Amino acid sequence: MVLSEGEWQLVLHVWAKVEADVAGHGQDILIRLFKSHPETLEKFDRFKHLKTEAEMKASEDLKKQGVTVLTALGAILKKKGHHEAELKPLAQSHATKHKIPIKYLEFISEAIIHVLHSRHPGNFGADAQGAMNKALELFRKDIAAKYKELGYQG
């Protein structure tokens, strides 16, 4: 697929708001993912023992992870579709070491769209959400195709 420049602008306009607070958004998104799909927490050995949302909000490790996830995702979105290089290493570790099914990437995409919608209503109307969804589907589709080349899942 191919987003138009206008769609990319809507995606990078709300992303610029997220970058004002990367660690806070990172927490909100991972906690939303873990509350919505608790099985995903099990993939994080460093903090899968966390039992509540308050323990999650106080975990430094979870917050660092969120910053790591959003910084790598922001670098991919800023490429506007030319992200082959950025995707390689990422697909190799998620397919061979961590073992993250495409279904989990769909879950966190959902969590991202939920948090932006809450925190950025004015910059996240229907057209901006449609563009963000399009950009995340593009990211999942290219990662799924790399997973297949690397020998993992479908």
Q: Which residues bind ligand HEM (CB under 6 A)?
A: 40, 43-46, 68-69, 72-73, 90, 93-94, 98, 100, 104-105, 108
Give the containing element (helix H, strand E) for 140. Answer: helix 126-150
CB nearer ligand HEM, residue 100 or residue 128 = 100
CB nearer ligand HEM, residue 25 or residue 122 = 25
How many whole angstroms separate alpha carbon 135 and alpha carbon 20?
Answer: 20
CB nearer ligand HEM, residue 27 or residue 40 = 40
| Least distance from ligand HEM to the Cβ atom of residue 100, Å | 5
CB nearer ligand HEM, residue 95 or residue 122 = 95
| Least distance from ligand HEM to the Cβ atom of residue 43, Å | 4
| Angle 116-18-122 from CA coordinates, rounded to 5° | 50
| Least distance from ligand HEM to the Cβ atom of residue 71, Å | 7
How many whole angstroms separate alpha carbon 35 and alpha carbon 21?
Answer: 21
Neighbours of 22 (CB within 10 A): 17
How many whole angstroms separate alpha carbon 14 and alpha carbon 35?
Answer: 24
| Least distance from ligand HEM to the Cβ atom of residue 92, Å | 8
